[PDB]
Design a protein around this ligand. Structure first.
Ligand SMILES: N[C@@H](Cc1c[nH]c[nH+]1)C(=O)O
Ligand SMILES: N[C@@H](Cc1c[nH]c[nH+]1)C(=O)O
Ligand SMILES: N[C@@H](Cc1c[nH]c[nH+]1)C(=O)O
Ligand SMILES: N[C@@H](Cc1c[nH]c[nH+]1)C(=O)O
Ligand SMILES: N[C@@H](Cc1c[nH]c[nH+]1)C(=O)O
Ligand SMILES: N[C@@H](Cc1c[nH]c[nH+]1)C(=O)O
Ligand SMILES: [Mg+2]
Ligand SMILES: [Mg+2]
Ligand SMILES: [Mg+2]
Ligand SMILES: [Mg+2]
Ligand SMILES: [Mg+2]
Ligand SMILES: [Mg+2]
Ligand SMILES: [Mg+2]
Ligand SMILES: [Mg+2]
Ligand SMILES: [Mg+2]
Ligand SMILES: [Mg+2]
Lengths: 146, 146, 146, 146, 146, 146
């Protein structure tokens, strides 16, 4: 009964370049956890939330018709987005835009089997002015029971 | 095209297990950037801030007597801590505690040399109740010009 | 010189089903306090604020032309809406919508007659995804002197 | 149609005077849901959180050794406390104190059985200066899946 | 047209050097408004709030035994303090300290007499690390009806 | 090596009537600091941010093409706007609008020449309902190294 850093897995999927994330994809392949990865460019924060919801449903990480799944996920997304905005969640209303990669991981990270499933949402990318090149990095992670 | 993800380097230092970080430590040597790593266990947020300020100074990443350096670092730390707390920056006052790794990296990551120096502060850890095992992961990143 | 739970009156008007709130309507009828009740469905928070302002003016709880009345009320509304959003006041920008009942009560709740008038704004309903059934409950209360 | 307003039950327990709550206590018996009530006087927010965690555990509403239960409850408590503080969760640090009743209710309130269990935490009280009589009402509600 | 910028008067009292404020002190005499000034050094925010409450009472700007007066003043103080902290109201808990001047002015600044009395609270100072010289300026203003 | 209250200079430019700010304009003329003044009426906060950015670039206080300058300024603007909104930065989404004067000052306020440049953003005006006359005053100040 080993414990796993599910959040760090999600983050690595969001921040490692393609073909560097091989070992993560294999760990998740082994323990048979559901996950998805995606990208979103946004000036409205709801577009982030919807992108992640669209991806998680699409790759069967969560069931769009089951509120407990969607409630779990929604709260994780909002925690992740707070990491990126480092305060109030605003993009366009504060004249900034973000370009982000995301990952979502659903699994059983705890040693005790009774801890059940947990979900992780990671974000990594840039935030900046609406003009290319006037930006820096940002990150977030959200965790919730599911 | 010559730009570097300084934040991702800092986050990788904070999150990769000791002994997995060699290629990040090598890149930093080649560019001759200053950096440091550390760990802090805290039930009060000022202990995080003091720990990272203490580390950065003692490793000569910043000059503790120069306000522009300490001003730049302080704001980057608060940004990183927001990512960890996902809302109001509180630990003990909301009955939670954190165990965090951190890293600080300063160099010049943009192509244009006029962009000068920037500093990244990354936190990766757990947060939870003050009871062993009742915790989950958290992450944060702050960036500032310096 | 009895004291009255004006906030709890407002809340009961917002959360009790119709025909259950009889005794509240009679207490308010007795002490001759002004009040109003209403409903709003919204994806933009300003639509909540405007609905409540429209109702309070309409039922003569406040004077639309007197800023001290409208300043009193506005601040109470925003406190109530914070209860509902449990953090940043966002609906649509965070991909959620709310369906709420409200009540506003204006009166003299304190024992001392010199405490003058006070106003209460209560909200109760659901918040959720923009899709019906994927929602749970929410509440708020705001109090201010007037 | 079979759904229940679990939050409204919790709020009614918290706010109705002792002896007025019988029909709420009866509904809860018929559905066989777990629940508890309590009171806390506090000048620090962690005392609220500790009080409700202590109560829920000691009445077997949650399992203090199971993180998914304590994780679900903790987030519901912070949501309820936001409603009380109407902004930053502070008491003593902003020179205020609170006297609150609380209730926690867990059962399954949705029609579809797959929605499983949810927990409500409700706070109703006063908040004010640390001087007798310089206070007004406050309320909060938090809901989470569990 | 007869309106007065009561907040600007309060801010000018707080920020102008002693001996530069005479014309503001004169305007206040002519209108016979109540007011007070003061200084507070603090590492905890409640010390600000207590200091301004203490000053207002002891100079008879407000009646410490009347809740409507203390309620009006308290909210104006928290607003002013938000301007100083530029986010979460924290000093010591985020490893910073402040040295502030304040002023409180109450009179009736609107044209229409029905608008009655209003109170302004202004803070002007520095905030910084608890080390001499590692600081910069900050300001705040709060207004409320009273 | 004298120290200068650069923030208080910016604030005075934002709050003093025209022809009253003479001595400030002369001090800045003497030390040869860059600055600009402006006005903005807005119901969307990004319109404030853009107005100030447009003015600062236009009067050569900052270089629009240099991210370190624009990053410095952006953060100062957001600190200033927090002073005005006294919490969450919202105007129209919370059914309020603002009419503001601003000033931006860039200079070398510290005694030590190694402290380099710093920038100040001040705001002063009114915030209120979208209807004229139902408003009161607001202020903010942001400081950052540059
Ligand atoms: N630096 C901002 C983003 C930005 C807006 N404009 C320029 N940069 C941030 O930390 O989010
Ligand atoms: N889950 C909390 C931490 C915690 C407090 N108590 C139990 N857990 C968080 O997300 O920060
Ligand atoms: N559960 C969210 C609302 C929601 C959005 N999407 C799904 N649910 C809240 O607490 O406000
Ligand atoms: N009125 C404050 C409580 C308070 C503090 N001091 C006086 N009253 C609030 O709304 O939370
Ligand atoms: N610069 C901080 C104050 C500070 C803390 N440590 C150093 N400086 C602020 O803007 O509030
Ligand atoms: N009084 C509000 C502004 C307002 C909105 N509506 C009426 N007034 C504030 O402090 O920001
Ligand atoms: Mg929810
Ligand atoms: Mg600063
Ligand atoms: Mg605090
Ligand atoms: Mg504290
Ligand atoms: Mg106001
Ligand atoms: Mg918004
Ligand atoms: Mg918006
Ligand atoms: Mg959690
Ligand atoms: Mg109050
Ligand atoms: Mg930035």
């Amino acid at each position: 009964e080993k414990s796993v850093r599910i959040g760090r897995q999600a983050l690595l999927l969001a921040m490692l370049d393609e073909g560097e994330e091989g070992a993560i994809l294999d760990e998740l392949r082994a323990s048979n956890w559901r996950y998805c990865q995606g990208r979103v460019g946004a000036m409205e924060p709801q577009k982030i939330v919807a992108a992640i919801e669209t991806a998680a449903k699409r790759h069967e990480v969560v069931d769009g018709s089951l509120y407990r799944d969607m409630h779990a996920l929604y709260h994780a997304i909002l925690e992740a987005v707070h990491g990126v905005t480092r305060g109030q969640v605003e993009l366009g209303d504060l004249l900034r835009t973000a370009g982000l990669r995301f990952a979502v991981v659903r699994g059983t990270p705890y040693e005790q089997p009774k801890e059940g499933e947990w979900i992780a949402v990671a974000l990594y990318g840039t935030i900046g002015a609406p003009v290319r090149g006037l930006e820096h990095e940002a990150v977030g992670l959200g965790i919730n029971h599911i």
